[PDB]
Design a protein around this ligand. Structure first.
Ligand SMILES: [Zn+2]
Lengths: 101, 21
């Protein structure tokens, strides 16, 4: 059904709350140097294997998302989420989730 | 489309949070 902006924001707050838990738990069971769980205001990026592309299904709670696609981040061999080259922002590809990209 | 307020809100999240330019 036609989700409203207020409903969408509510689901984001609920998803953001789930991301806080997944972070606290991992930060209570630490192991190795993987990329840490991270909330980017859209979805919760999970533990990333270092040196690899991390793929996350386009979240089901975003109404205007293609839920058959994936969003992507890059986790380097140091366990840090890779920045965009030449910029100071974390690299993420959402082109599969959305029509205007 | 649907709610343009919802759509245009997602425009902002995608604009700052899709960073591959
Ligand atoms: Zn606006």
């Amino acid at each position: 059904d036609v989700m409203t902006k207020e409903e969408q924001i509510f689901l984001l707050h609920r998803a953001q709350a789930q991301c806080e838990k997944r972070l606290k738990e991992v930060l209570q069971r630490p192991a190795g140097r993987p990329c840490l769980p991270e909330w980017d205001h859209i979805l919760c990026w999970p533990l990333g294997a270092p040196g690899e592309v991390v793929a996350v299904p386009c979240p089901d709670y975003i109404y205007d998302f293609n839920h058959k696609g994936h969003a992507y981040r890059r986790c380097d061999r140091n366990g840090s989420w890779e920045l965009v080259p030449g910029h100071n922002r974390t690299w993420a590809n959402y082109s599969e989730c959305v029509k205007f990209l | 489309i649907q709610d343009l307020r919802r759509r245009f809100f997602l425009h902002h999240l995608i604009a700052e949070x899709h960073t591959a330019e």
